[PDB]
Amino acid sequence: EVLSVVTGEDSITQIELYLNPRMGVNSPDLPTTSNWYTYTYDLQPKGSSPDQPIKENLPAYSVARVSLPMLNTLQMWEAISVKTEVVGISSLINVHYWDMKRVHDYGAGIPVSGVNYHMFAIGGEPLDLQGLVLDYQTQYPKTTNGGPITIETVLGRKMTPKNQGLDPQAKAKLDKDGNYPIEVWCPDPSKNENSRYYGSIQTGSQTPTVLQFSNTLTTVLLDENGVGPLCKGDGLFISCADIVGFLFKTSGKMALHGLPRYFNVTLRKRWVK
Amino acid sequence: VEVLSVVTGEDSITQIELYLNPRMGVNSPDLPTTSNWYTYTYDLQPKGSSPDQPIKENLPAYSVARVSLPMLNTLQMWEAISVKTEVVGISSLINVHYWDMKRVHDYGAGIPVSGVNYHMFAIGGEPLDLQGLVLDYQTQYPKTGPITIETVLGRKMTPKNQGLDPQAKAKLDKDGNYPIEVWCPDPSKNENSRYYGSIQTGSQTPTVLQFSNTLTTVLLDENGVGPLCKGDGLFISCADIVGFLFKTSGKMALHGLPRYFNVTLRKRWVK
Amino acid sequence: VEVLSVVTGEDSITQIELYLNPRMGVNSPDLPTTSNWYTYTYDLQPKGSSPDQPIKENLPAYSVARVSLPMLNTLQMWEAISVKTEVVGISSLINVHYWDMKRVHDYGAGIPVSGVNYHMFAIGGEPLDLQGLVLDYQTQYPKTGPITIETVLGRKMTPKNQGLDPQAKAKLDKDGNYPIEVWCPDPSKNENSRYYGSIQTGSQTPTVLQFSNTLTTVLLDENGVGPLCKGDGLFISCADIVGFLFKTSGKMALHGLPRYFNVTLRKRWVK
Amino acid sequence: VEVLSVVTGEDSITQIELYLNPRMGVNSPDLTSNWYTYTYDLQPKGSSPDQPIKENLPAYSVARVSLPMLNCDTLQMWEAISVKTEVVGISSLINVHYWDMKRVHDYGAGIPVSGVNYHMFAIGGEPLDLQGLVLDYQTQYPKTGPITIETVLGRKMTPKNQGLDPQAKAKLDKDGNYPIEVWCPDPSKNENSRYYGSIQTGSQTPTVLQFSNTLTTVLLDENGVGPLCKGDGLFISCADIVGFLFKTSGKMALHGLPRYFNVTLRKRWVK
Amino acid sequence: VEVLSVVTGEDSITQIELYLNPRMGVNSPDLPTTSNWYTYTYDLQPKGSSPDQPIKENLPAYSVARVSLPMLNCDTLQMWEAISVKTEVVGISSLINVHYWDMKRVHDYGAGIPVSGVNYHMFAIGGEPLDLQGLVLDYQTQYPKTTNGGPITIETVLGRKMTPKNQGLDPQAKAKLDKDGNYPIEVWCPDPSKNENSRYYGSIQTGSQTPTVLQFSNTLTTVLLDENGVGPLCKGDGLFISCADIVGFLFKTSGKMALHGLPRYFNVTLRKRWVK
Ligand SMILES: [Cl-]
Ligand SMILES: [Cl-]
Ligand SMILES: [Cl-]
Ligand SMILES: [Cl-]
Ligand SMILES: [Cl-]
């Protein structure tokens, strides 16, 4: 039960973080494979059943838990507003990647474009996820083999046709950076009372990537009762995903690309019962 | 049905929650060996000769549910005042590696789900009123099966059914049985429902969709009165076609996503 | 005519409902011979030689009705204050399996109704004022029968009719008779009407349309006065071209949808 | 020029109506006049230099309106406070059967007027201040006969006229003489004008335009002051390029539409 | 650093006007042999082999100016506070030209493909240099090493080679936008983790022939006050103005393509503010 806002000196605090994209090649530090950090490997229809995608072809949600100043009818940190920005947008004007497919003979490269997916979330606990897939017959790498967490992971059995729709048993929590595939998991609207999430998709193969950036834009995190996400155990949960389109390679091969996201969250102290 | 004052008291407000799975043509996930295409149509392909005889698996239909509300009884009725609604599984559409997906060019990714979209929802205190109108009146719809204009008139369609025929009316009272291409919301009725919809045409038109748990639709009309649930029944209807799945052969199927609803209702005195 | 106060009394507000079927070129559903193409044009093609001599079936025209209002009679006039309007049958445009539909690629679905859109509606207390302007003044329109610039001028068009010629004026007083490609609302007149319209060109441009029974248009001008119905007549006009039907041969016909109106009117004193 | 109080009295408001026909290159209908409201064929040579013809240089429309004379160090001036403006003849663009139109494909309709759009209007109490900037400084425009950067400089352009050169300035004082591709509004001046404009580039980009007689633009600045009409002259300027006419041969010509204005003015004391 | 009251009395408000010409790669109009390409890049092309070694002329960069403000002046001082700006991309109308002699025709005998494709638009008003964050499409790109202070890239500020982490957010890859036409747009974006004393506003549009859609109007004002009602405060009596306005490609007959940019105009209103 939520009570009055705490009045006093150090009642407001400001938290900063950035999250690097987890597109498939999720580390910049690996000796050899890390050239493709912020990218997938080449995305291709197999041409025969079943699909058996590799983890490098499975862009995943970014998530971080931020520890907040210790507080203790108790006081909890309440997230009230956030400034967030996708970073490195200007990098996408580059149309002279050495192995870029040209728009036509002697032309510039096809710029990063096509499929976009953009979401962020701010919550006082992990984001609630609902599982739904394009094709239930997809064989995702097993979690026990080092793969991501998918619907088969949570069910403890194979997906059935119902997982192409909304199966209420196909649920999870976003508690692991770079391990929950975007194509498997979306925000669960039946839950997430203590989170605020905002997202969009854009399909098409060469659809223009259209993005804005400004340090003047603020998202208010209060619900219709004037209450923001309340941070359980002094943890603020921050999640996102920013697919910005394909890198088109000379051969015809295509890899998805992501960008990092920055957050500045304002929190206040709130009495709870 | 004269509307009196809003009821005051302890248990005067309730919230109703549900989800509706899409009824694209393959409507059940529980079938021997046809359910692999659940949430899809079969292949949509102009025959090249008349007449068109579309199969039921090629007719996306409206989803509908009647939610039973806590029994109440000048009487009290539940009044829907607002709704949070969301299209679920939007993220599933970043998949450009379906095993049998047509590629955008040699060695490239699959053409993503794109093209024709159609998105509507309705919240009402009775079944949504429907108006019949078809692209081609000479279309031979299967008999009962889906309910079409021929079904309701008990005679064949004539050219007037390419426009607005006042006799071509139905009530959306059955899940997965009223084809989208045949029926639309009747704006001449639906006093006790609220509906919101759009269409997008084109073959590879980008599917552009938003999702947020911060967005609320107010269901009150200009007199501050929401839909009043007759017989303690709330009717929820929707359709969400999100584009085509492009197969290697060149064939194409339409695809749909489920929709979630959270409706807030209050008690209302009525005479 | 001087506008006085709004009339007060029990029966001073009234509501008017109607629908207008589209007049695309084949304008009747009742012709045993040709009505299959009702709500469509015939095939649209450049002749390849001069001059263009378009047939009436290829000239979409404005829809119009005069609604008779209750007789009131310094006297009282009906004042249109708001309107709920909706394009009907939007959902029909998801059909991508018309038997003679041009496939998007080999073995694919049909090219959806798409391309050129033109959408307008008007509410007035007298016929809409029309201004004539054409793409090509050398066009030989069928004699009256559609009413064109030649009809009103009593002589051949000249180059000036490719721009604004103040002599090229008409009243929208007949359903299905004034070609959209010749006539547009006249902004220099129409003080007793409200009109709202748009165009979309391109050949395969997505048709993007919305429908809701919650959207109202306010018809009051900046002085709080709506159209006043001369002789107790309410004039409702519209046009809704929704794109091309792409046929297997390559041929293309423009298509239209009907429109619904619910207009609220109040009594007003005038001198 | 010190602005005092608004004049109050019986006859202190006036309305100015006018229309401006487009000046796309063929600027008169009273001759060649078949192509009035169009350019000639726009076509990169493939070799240098470009020496465009005047018929290929769409220009700004302008009119000075003589206002009722009003009149001391302190006198009355007309102040433009608002305007209704509308692009006329938008409906004419539904024509996809110009006799010489390039087809979208074999047997199909003509490619609709579409592609490059440029739309701007301006209301001022003096001529619109113009800034010169060209795509290519090596372009050799015709001598006076349109007014260009060379005309005002009295010498040939240099590379800097591809950017902002502060010497490349002019006033929009003559209808049909200032090329759009050479001149844009000068944001460093124009204190006594309001202007509003947009561009859209591309070859077949949909032309998307709206029209309504219910839309007003307020001309008051941040201090509640509209343009003040020096010597009782109101200056009205525009351009409305609506896309290409696509010809069978592959040749392409730009097309313009006229614009209507209704300007409301009030009397204002000035020192 | 503590903001007190707005100053009152005559002449507390001043206005600053300027324009910034674009720096697309060919940055001067005064070099007789190459200045024909002023406001354009050279031809943009994927090399076909590793590594990319891009030339300066192919690196559109930010425009920046530092405007000197009137002197005003102790613990309590007056500073200029930028409160609003009218800004406009100039020469938008020039883009209707589809008959450039070497313009690629849209189809046989047709008009030229108009300037279109990749747009990038941003402007900033600040009381100090804009803070930059470095991030590149490909970390293996070998940007030019020069001796004349430009182009400045990630390697320049690190004093060592980029690693894979420079395809993401590397907190060490930071700089200040302190020199006109020297900081490449494809390397640097505004740093949202700083810039407390600047306001910035920007967008991108990708695709190759995507319509260039721009507006212009002298009635458009951008308010520069933060949520506390405080605009950028000009330290050293210096107002920093930055922008970039890439408006698309020039499609040449050969198939070759160059990016093009337009200048930007600014009218900034400032007021005197007491500070501690
Ligand atoms: Cl998106
Ligand atoms: Cl839609
Ligand atoms: Cl339209
Ligand atoms: Cl435009
Ligand atoms: Cl942009």
PDB file of C-alpha atoms and ligand atoms in Angstrom, chain C residues 117-119 198-200 241, chain D residues 209, ligand 3:
ATOM      1  CA  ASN C 117      -7.189   8.078 -53.108  1.00  0.00           C
ATOM      2  CA  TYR C 118      -9.513  11.059 -52.995  1.00  0.00           C
ATOM      3  CA  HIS C 119     -11.598  11.715 -49.902  1.00  0.00           C
ATOM      4  CA  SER C 198      -7.601  15.182 -49.267  1.00  0.00           C
ATOM      5  CA  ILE C 199      -5.795  13.528 -52.166  1.00  0.00           C
ATOM      6  CA  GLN C 200      -3.186  10.802 -52.434  1.00  0.00           C
ATOM      7  CA  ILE C 241     -11.901   6.883 -54.084  1.00  0.00           C
TER       8      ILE C 241
ATOM      9  CA  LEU D 209      -2.641  17.489 -50.214  1.00  0.00           C
TER      10      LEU D 209
HETATM   11 CL    CL F   3      -6.705  10.920 -49.717  1.00  0.00          CL
END
